[PDB]
Enzyme design. Structure first.
Site, PDB file in Angstrom:
ATOM      1  N   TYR A  90       2.755  -2.384  12.463  1.00 53.87           N
ATOM      2  CA  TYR A  90       2.114  -1.660  11.376  1.00 53.87           C
ATOM      3  C   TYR A  90       1.904  -0.167  11.548  1.00 53.87           C
ATOM      4  CZ  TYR A  90       1.169  -5.988   8.934  1.00 53.87           C
ATOM      5  OH  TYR A  90       1.286  -7.183   8.256  1.00 53.87           O
ATOM      6  N   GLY A 143       2.845   3.446  11.715  1.00 55.04           N
ATOM      7  CA  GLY A 143       3.978   4.114  11.096  1.00 55.04           C
ATOM      8  C   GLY A 143       4.080   3.733   9.621  1.00 55.04           C
ATOM      9  N   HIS A 191      -5.883   0.512   8.307  1.00 57.76           N
ATOM     10  CA  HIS A 191      -5.752   1.889   7.851  1.00 57.76           C
ATOM     11  C   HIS A 191      -4.799   2.004   6.672  1.00 57.76           C
ATOM     12  CE1 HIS A 191      -4.491   6.228   8.193  1.00 57.76           C
ATOM     13  NE2 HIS A 191      -5.744   6.157   7.835  1.00 57.76           N
ATOM     14  N   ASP A 192      -3.666   1.284   6.745  1.00 57.42           N
ATOM     15  CA  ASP A 192      -2.663   1.237   5.687  1.00 57.42           C
ATOM     16  C   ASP A 192      -3.221   0.569   4.445  1.00 57.42           C
ATOM     17  OD1 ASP A 192       0.003   1.471   4.543  1.00 57.42           O
ATOM     18  OD2 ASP A 192       0.627  -0.385   5.441  1.00 57.42           O
ATOM     19  N   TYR A 196      -6.032   3.058   2.784  1.00 54.25           N
ATOM     20  CA  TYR A 196      -5.273   4.004   1.995  1.00 54.25           C
ATOM     21  C   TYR A 196      -4.762   3.382   0.699  1.00 54.25           C
ATOM     22  CZ  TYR A 196      -4.314   8.103   5.177  1.00 54.25           C
ATOM     23  OH  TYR A 196      -4.315   9.303   5.863  1.00 54.25           O
ATOM     24  N   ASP A 211      -9.440   7.489   7.594  1.00 51.19           N
ATOM     25  CA  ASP A 211      -8.975   8.240   8.744  1.00 51.19           C
ATOM     26  C   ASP A 211      -9.919   8.323   9.929  1.00 51.19           C
ATOM     27  OD1 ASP A 211      -6.458   8.955   7.609  1.00 51.19           O
ATOM     28  OD2 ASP A 211      -7.302  10.632   6.582  1.00 51.19           O
TER      29      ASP A 211
END
Length: 119
Positions: free
Chosen positions: A28, A30, A48-49, A52, A93
């Site tokens: 995950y 990247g 985090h992905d 977002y 973040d």
């Protein structure tokens, strides 16, 4: 934005690891969503992905959000209260930055064949 994310990473870890080291880790990190999170650090990157993504559903572009933070001696912290999308993206973040630092880094899980390992 991502320049600020890279700054929040270096503040939470205190120089011990380059941001580059985190951008091609596991399945995950990247931002390519795939298979199972192989590691603790890899779960930080999935979360985090996903963070977002909620942001983008609320109208917050994670890319175009230049927020306000302060890098203290214990790591980063967000200063927005009112400007709500800037504070949401800052939290994605900041929490990822601390996650990356407290998480163990397997050098063996950096740059794995995601075509094979992340199905």
């Amino acid at each position: 934005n991502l320049v600020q994310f890279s700054y929040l990473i270096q503040c939470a870890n205190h120089g011990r690891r380059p941001t580059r080291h985190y951008m091609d880790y596991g399945c995950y990190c990247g931002w390519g969503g795939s298979g199972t999170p192989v590691d603790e650090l890899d779960r930080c990157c999935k979360i985090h992905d996903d963070c977002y993504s909620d942001a983008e559903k609320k109208g917050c572009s994670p890319k175009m959000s230049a927020y306000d933070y302060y890098c203290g001696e214990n790591g980063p912290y967000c200063r927005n209260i009112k400007k709500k999308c800037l504070r949401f993206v800052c939290d994605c973040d900041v929490e990822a930055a601390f996650c990356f630092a407290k998480a163990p880094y397997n050098n063996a899980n950096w740059n794995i064949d995601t075509k094979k390992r992340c199905q």
